[PDB]
Amino acid sequence: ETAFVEVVLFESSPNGDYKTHTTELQGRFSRAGATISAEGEIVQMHPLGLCDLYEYGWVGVVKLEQPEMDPKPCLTVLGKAKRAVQRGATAVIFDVSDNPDAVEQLNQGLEDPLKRPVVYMKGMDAIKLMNIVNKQKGARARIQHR
Amino acid sequence: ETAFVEVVLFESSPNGDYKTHTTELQGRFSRAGATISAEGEIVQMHPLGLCYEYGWVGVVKLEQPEMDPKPCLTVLGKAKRAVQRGATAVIFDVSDNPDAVEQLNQGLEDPLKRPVVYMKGMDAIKLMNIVNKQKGARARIQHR
Ligand SMILES: [Br-]
Numbered sequence: 001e002t003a004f005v006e007v008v009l010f011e012s013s014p015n016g017d018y019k020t021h022t023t024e025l026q027g028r029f030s031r032a033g034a035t036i037s038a039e040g041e042i043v044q045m046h047p048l049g050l051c052d053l054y055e056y057g058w059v060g061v062v063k064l065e066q067p068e069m070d071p072k073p074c075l076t077v078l079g080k081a082k083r084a085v086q087r088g089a090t091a092v093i094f095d096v097s098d099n100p101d102a103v104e105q106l107n108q109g110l111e112d113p114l115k116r117p118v119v120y121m122k123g124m125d126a127i128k129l130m131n132i133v134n135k136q137k138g139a140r141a142r143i144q145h146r
Numbered sequence: 147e148t149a150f151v152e153v154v155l156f157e158s159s160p161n162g163d164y165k166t167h168t169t170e171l172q173g174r175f176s177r178a179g180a181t182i183s184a185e186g187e188i189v190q191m192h193p194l195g196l197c198y199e200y201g202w203v204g205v206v207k208l209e210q211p212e213m214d215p216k217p218c219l220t221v222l223g224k225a226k227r228a229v230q231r232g233a234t235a236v237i238f239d240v241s242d243n244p245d246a247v248e249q250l251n252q253g254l255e256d257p258l259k260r261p262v263v264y265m266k267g268m269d270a271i272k273l274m275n276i277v278n279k280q281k282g283a284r285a286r287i288q289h290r
Binding site: 008010012016017018036038039040041046052053055056057086087088124138140142143144145146 | 154157158161162164165182183184185186187199200201229230232234282284286288289
């Protein structure tokens with residue numbers, strides 16, 4: 001199915017209230033990852049980072065590399081996804097704009113699928129995602145399946 | 147519509163890995179707030195406490211209406227103020243004050259952009275049973 005991923009940039013007023021600028025992106029729920037909603041603070045995982053505690057229920061955003069960069073990977077992208085969940089991601093967003101074989105890897109379906117959205121994302125939405133993801137200290141990802 | 151609220155009790159292990167214990171509950175989406183999903187770590191507000199890290203799930207447990215005759219805030223106000231303070235959904239427990247529910251579901255006001263879930267009877271009982279035990283719990287709030 002299709003994921004409607006909203007990305008929130010939040011900034012607190014001096015008296016303790018918050019202001020937002022949200023941004024609405026689109027990916028795809030994968031065969032491997034459950035098709036539910038979610039939400040949490042985004043940690044930007046280096047793809048090699050999955051081979052440092054975080055509080056629980058955060059949303060990993062890995063951008064996958066040009067495939068010749070990792071000839072013998074530490075893990076299959078699916079491995080990377082299920083390890084993040086062990087490490088306590090509530091969710092998972094992959095940028096595949098560099099590795100569209102991820103899509104086959106991810107949509108296998110052979111295994112029992114994760115209980116959590118593993119969502120992939122490419123082209124321009126991946127751009128606007130990283131655009132914002134690098135900008136400020138904390139950004140909260142809302143994922144829905146409306 | 148029925149709010150599927152699911153409550154994680156997380157425990158850190160040797161690896162850095164976590165082990166869970168989900169508790170599967172139910173409520174209603176109120177009309178004061180959007181009918182969508184949400185999650186975040188559960189912060190317990192005292193009802194008079196409306197008078198954090200952005201993205202938290204306020205849980206109020208409302209009380210006998212004769213305990214606070216002149217409220218500093220409507221229950222609607224309470225839900226809106228929590229959203230002002232970065233709440234990303236807001237779950238009340240109307241068990242003791244069932245007139246709140248009318249006030250929430252008036253519809254004169256234009257709705258919040260957040261789940262405003264209410265709850266009662268048994269399912270809140272489990273809910274509060276869990277909030278009071280742990281320090282921190284995730285409220286996944288699921289719109290199916
Ligand atoms: Br692997």
